[PDB]
Amino acid sequence: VWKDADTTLFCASDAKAHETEVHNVWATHACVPTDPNPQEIHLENVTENFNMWKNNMVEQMQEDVISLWDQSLQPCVKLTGGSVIKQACPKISFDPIPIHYCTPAGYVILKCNDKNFNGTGPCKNVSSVQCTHGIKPVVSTQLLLNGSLAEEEIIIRSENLTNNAKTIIVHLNKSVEINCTRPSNGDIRKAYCEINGTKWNKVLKQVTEKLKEHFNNKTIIFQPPSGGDLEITMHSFNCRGEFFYCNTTQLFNNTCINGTITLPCKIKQIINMWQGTGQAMYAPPIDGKINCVSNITGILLTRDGGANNTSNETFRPGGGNIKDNWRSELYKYKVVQIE
C-alpha cells in the first residue's frame, strides 16, 4: 500500500557543535542527531523497480552539498553572471563526514538488497528504512573516493549501456588506496598520489574483464581523456581545502594491464566550479605536509562512440556531473509515500 513519490528529506549526522570543520559546522545547524538504533524491515515477497538515474534523492543531496560549499568554500575572486566579485578567502578546516538522508512522517525509504543489482530494474530483496547509510559528500572526478564497495562481484551502472553519451559507473568490490601528498619540501603546487601498481592493475583487469561481458566479448581499451577541462581530464578532488589535480594516464594507460605508481599532481588556485558558476581563484597552498589517503571505491568512465562494427571499445576516465557521485551511493534507495 505505497507509491513512488518525492518529498522534503532531512539529514542526520554525528557532527560536533564545537568544531570549526566546515562539514561539522553545516551539519550542526542543518541536520539532526543520528538514530541510536535504526530499524530495518524486510518486506516479504515484495518486488520493486529502481532507477538510480531518475532519483530525486540525488538532486536533494546535490542541493545540500552546493549549499555547504557555497557557505564554506568561498574563493578570493569569483566570476559568475558577468560580475567579478572580490572577497575574503581564509583557509578552512575541510574533511567530509558521513551524512544520513531520511524521510519525514508518512514516508519511507525502500532499500534494494540484491547483491547483484546494477541500479535500474526490479529488485527481489527489498527492505524498509528511515534513513540511508552514512554517505560522505566527497566531490571528485574520474575516481570515486571514500565510498561504499560492491559486496559481491564488480558492478557496471548505466542508464543506457549502448549510449556512448551516457556516463558509466564502476562499483569496485575491493578498495585501492590512493595516497596523495604535497610534501612540506619544486613548486608548492607540485604533489603526487602513490598507488600500489599490483593492487590497481589487478582491479583494472577485473574491470576490463567484466566490461567485456557487457559488450559481448569485444576488446576493451583504456585511454586518457580525449579532451575537455582539467577538472575532467584529470582526477580532481579537494584535500584539506586544497584543490588537487592529478594526471591519471599511468592509471589508464595499458602497460601492466608492478611497483609504486606515482601520479603527477597539481594544486591549482584557478578552478572551474563544479556548481557551474564559472571559474574562481583561491589562495596558495597551506604550509607543511598535505596528505590525503583515500579508498578508490568507484570509477567514472566514458566510452567512445566512434566504433560500430569494430572489434574494440575504448573507455576513458570521465565524470564532471557531481550528481553521478551521489548516484554511486544512492542507487539502492527510493522514496515512497505510504498509503
Ligand X SMILES: Cc1nc([C@@H](NC(=O)c2ccc(-c3ccc(Cl)cc3)[nH]2)[C@H]2CCCCN2)sc1CO
Ligand Y SMILES: *[C@@H]1O[C@H](CO)[C@@H](O)[C@H](O)[C@H]1NC(C)=O
Residues binding ligand Y (CB under 6 A): 96, 113, 118, 120-121, 125, 138, 145-146, 153-154, 156, 158, 160-163, 173-175, 179, 181, 194, 196, 198-199, 206, 210, 224, 233-234, 237, 239, 247, 249, 259-260, 292-295
Nearer CB in complex with ligand X: 199/323: 323
- The residue within the footprint of ligand X, chosen from 159, 229, 256, 264 (CB under 6 A), is 229
In the complex, the smallest distance separating the C-beta of residue 237 from ligand X, rounded to whole angstroms, is: 5
- CA torsion 156-157-161-164 (nearest 10°) is -100
Least Å distance, CB 292 to ligand X, is 11
Cβ burial of 109 (10 Å; 0-12, 13-18, 19+) is buried
Phi and psi at 214, nearest 5°, equal -95, -15
Q: What is the sign of the dihedral through the CA atoms of 309, 315, 320 and 321?
A: positive
Name 79's bridge partners.
84
Q: Is residue 320 within the footprint of ligand X (CB under 6 A)?
A: yes
Among 21, 64, 231, 329, binds ligand X (CB under 6 A): 231
Parallel, antiparallel, or unpaired: how do β-strands 333-338 and 40-42 relate?
unpaired
Residue 113 touches which of ligand Y, ligand X, none (Cβ within 5-8 Å per kind): ligand Y
273 touches which of ligand Y, ligand X, none (CB within 5 to 8 A by kind)? ligand X
- Residue that has been written with the C-alpha cell 551502472 in this structure: 157
Write down the least CB distance from residue 321 to ligand X, Å: 8
Any long-range contacts for 118-122 (C-beta under 8 Å, 24+ apart)? Answer: 118/155, 118/156, 118/157, 119/50, 119/51, 119/52, 119/53, 119/155, 119/157, 119/158, 119/169, 119/327, 119/331, 120/50, 120/51, 120/52, 120/53, 120/159, 121/49, 121/50, 122/47, 122/48, 122/49, 122/50
CB nearer to ligand Y: give 73 or 78.
73
Smallest gap, in angstroms, from Cβ of residue 34 to ligand X? 27
> By CB under 6 A, what part of segment 125-164 binds ligand X?
139-141
Taking the least distance from each CB to ligand X, the nearer of 135 and 322 is 322
Q: Is 95 in the site for ligand X (CB under 6 A)?
A: no
Q: State the minimum distance, in angstroms, from the CB of residue 320 to ligand X.
A: 4
Question: DSSP character for 44?
Answer: T
**Residues within the interface to ligand X (CB under 6 A):** 139-141, 228-229, 231-232, 236-238, 243, 271-276, 320
